[PDB]
Amino acid sequence: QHIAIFTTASIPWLTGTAVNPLFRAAYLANDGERRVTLVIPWLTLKHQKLVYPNSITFSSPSEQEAYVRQWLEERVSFRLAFEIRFYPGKFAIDKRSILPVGDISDAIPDEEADIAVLEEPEHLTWKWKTKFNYVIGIVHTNYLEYVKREKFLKYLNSWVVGIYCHKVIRLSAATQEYPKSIVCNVHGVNPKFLEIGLRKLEQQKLQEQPFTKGAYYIGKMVWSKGYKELLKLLEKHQKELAELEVDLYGDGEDSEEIKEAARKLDLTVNVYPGRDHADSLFHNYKVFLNPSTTDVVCTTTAEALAMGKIVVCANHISNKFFKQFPNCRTYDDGQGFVRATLKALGEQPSQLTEQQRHELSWEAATQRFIKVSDLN
Ligand SMILES: O=c1ccn([C@@H]2O[C@H](COP(=O)(O)OP(=O)(O)O[C@H]3O[C@H](CO)[C@H](O)[C@H](O)[C@H]3O)[C@@H](O)[C@H]2O)c(=O)[nH]1
CATH class of the missing domain: 3.40.50.2000 (Glycogen Phosphorylase B;)
Incomplete structure (x- = not known):
């Protein structure tokens, strides 16, 4: 065959x-x-x-x-x-x-x-x-x-x-x-992501400090990939998310428009070039924010979960598979996004069963x- x-x-x-x-x-x-x-x-x-x-x-x-x-x-x-x-x-x-x-x-x-x-x-x-x-x-x-x-x-x-x-x-x-x-x-997911999650679990058990307490998104820099919706949510709830730092990573045609929008917010939102998601720079972010509603399946969400992070994502049919994971927090609206994001920053990601790691x-x-x- x-x-x-x-x-x-x-x-x-x-x-x-x-x-x-x-x-x-x-x-x-x-x-x-x-x-x-x-x-x-x-x-x-x-x-x-x-x-x-x-x-x-x-x-x-x-x-x-x-x-x-x-x-x-x-x-x-x-x-x-x-x-x-x-x-x-x-x-x-x-x-x-x-x-x-x-x-x-x-x-x-x-x-x-x-x-x-x-x-x-x-x-x-x-x-x-x-x-x-x-x-x-x-x-x-x-x-x-x-x-x-x-x-x-x-x-x-x-x-x-x-x-x-x-x-x-x-x-x-x-x-x-x-x-x-x-x-x-x-x-x-690339098995490197699961390996990175097992390493962050072992750190948590050792009480190394596995996590920094900001957020990131990664994805090609086109408006339709989540950026538009993330920036509006950020802009609508600026005041409540004063303490939030967000790093955005990607290349593409809208990167300069997205940057421009980012610096009009009372939030530290920064824009950076694309980079492989498995790079060590990603390893310590606690929260991945994924507001895409245009993906069929967001591979990056699977990857973030595998790494032991908390994913805040839209309550949409493309994320139906990820909802079986407790570190996946869905929101139906702007208020839901903020409450979910603030709760995640404050808390420890939960640990993945062996059955979960297998499923990814x-x-x-x-x-x-x-x-x-x-x-x-
Ligand atoms: O800067 C980047 C961008 C992407 N990736 C990697 O690229 C892969 C896919 O990334 P995305 O899903 O963000 O990239 P695409 O949107 O370009 O992927 C495409 O197909 C996927 C399914 O194969 C999605 O469902 C989506 O609908 C479609 O555009 C993942 O391994 C992700 O880690 C990086 O490492 N760095």
Whole structure:
């Protein structure tokens, strides 16, 4: 059995359709009696500078491949055991997105084709039901919610997917309806986050001081990613949140507008460049504030919980999975946000059961995936 996983982004672009399909591949290919190939976009150097930390650019696919293997080997315990292939892509800046150039199916000879996983089937289907036996799409994005919010897809998405995908996994119910679909959060968290939570637990037990008493958000700096709602909440409740310090981390097109809004508040809210969420600078924040209502599943929330933090997030259907965790505090309104945030700053995060830590893991996500995709 051979699984070909086609996605719309690659490390070092720190975005869900880069990070999650990469872990998926790592943990599928460990499952043992199964060959995994991950198929990722190659950008020319001009486009690479747009999405990579231009610290990081590759003059060939082979370099990018060494870099992606290194990055993932640094993060998982085991030796990787899947293959990596590239298709040519082009970053369309107005789509905020990588568009394929060839038939991407081409990356996989006919002679080895078996099962195809399309991360973001909507774009990747702009060959399929006829070149592979079995095609599974995974919906990572709320396409509708992001184009309907630029300073339609809709019915084409339905049939596009339906024509090409035998099964459709929606990461949550904050998505378009789709044919042959199941809701299932088939993502976990980089095991580094769980390791960081076990280290913060051990510090708590040692009474080191695990935590500083401010908050942070991390995510690409576009208004529609939570920033707009966070800044309005902050601005509405400035007076009650006088003691709150908030650090915001990300890159993107709105970073200068967000900065500008931040310095008009009577709160210390600071804006900084994007950075890997697993970096040591994040390790001691006690509270992660996530007000996105446009994510399908907020991988960053999963990551923050794994690290042992308290997450204050919107009481919205995309956060339904996280509500099983006691350190996840949901709010229906501005008052709820403030009360939840003030209580969290004041208190100790609670500790995660072993059953919780497992539920956030890629080992668990893979089992769910294997199960909802009839791959048994
Ligand atoms: O500055 C950053 C930004 C992101 N990340 C990492 O990137 C991954 C995804 O981050 P986000 O979910 O903030 O990035 P995207 O919004 O760009 O992810 C996309 O897909 C996800 C699911 O795969 C989400 O559900 C969302 O709908 C969609 O835009 C996480 O591992 C997060 O830690 C960083 O390390 N640093």
